[PDB]
Amino acid sequence: SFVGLRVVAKWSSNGYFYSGKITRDVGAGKYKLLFDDGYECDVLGKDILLCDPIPLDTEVTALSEDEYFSAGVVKGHRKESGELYYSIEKEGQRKWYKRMAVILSLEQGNRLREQYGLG
Amino acid sequence: GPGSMLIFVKTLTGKTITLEVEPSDTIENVKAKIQDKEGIPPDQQRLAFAGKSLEDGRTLSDYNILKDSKHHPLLRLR
């Protein structure tokens, strides 16, 4: 079952992918998704990436302390207090980001579809 | 239009949406875009960036928020 799996998923044709979990396989090619920041909605299967964690050297978009999203590369991960943190490099410098602060642009997520797309 | 810039907005429900904005867009225009996309009436919207309130009649540029096209600010509804 995909139910209970962690994923990264988008809910619009050109949108960003956000981390969450599948809570149900529902009708019409869709899955109910609970996103980590609390938003719940149905999403199309084509818009789900079953990668958890996002692998090393993936290009991602991450929210810095200064409240800007920008691109970086995954360099590591850590599990602590039941939470996952990613080490992401931007402009040669690594910082640690909560899972929910790491998202994928349309282009970045499309790069992972062949290996991690659902179905 | 062609010189528009991507921003993110986190709503009270925990959903983050994207918007394209102009440097000349006022905060009221941003609130209208949020209404148009997400259905939240402007009268419910209070926007902040990095913990500072964004006033009516200002643009994001009047707060030095917009950078290059490589860095996208997250605004937060409060």
Residue numbers in the entry:
A (entry chain A): 1485 to 1603
B (entry chain B): -3 to 74
Publication text:
In this study, we leverage this functional screening system to assess focused libraries targeting the protein-protein interface of i53, an engineered ubiquitin derivative, and its binding target, 53BP1. Using these classifications, we determined that the addition of i53 variants results in an increase of HDR by specifically reducing NHEJ events but not MMEJ nor other types of outcomes, consistent to their role as 53BP1 antagonists.
Of the 19 new variants tested, one (L67R) was found to be significantly enriched relative to parent i53 (L67), although L67H was borderline significant and was also moved on to subsequent validation. To understand the molecular basis of the improved activity and binding of the de novo i53 variants identified in our screens, we solved crystal structures of each variant bound to 53BP1 (S2.2, S2.3, S2.4, S2.5 and S2.6). We observed that the L67R change enables a new 2.8 Å H-bond with D1550 of 53BP1, and that L67H forms a network of inter- and intramolecular H-bonds, including a water mediated H-bond to S1554 of 53BP1 and an H-bond to D64 on i53. The intermolecular H-bond to D64 could help lock the i53 loop conformation observed in the crystal structure and lower the entropic penalty for binding.
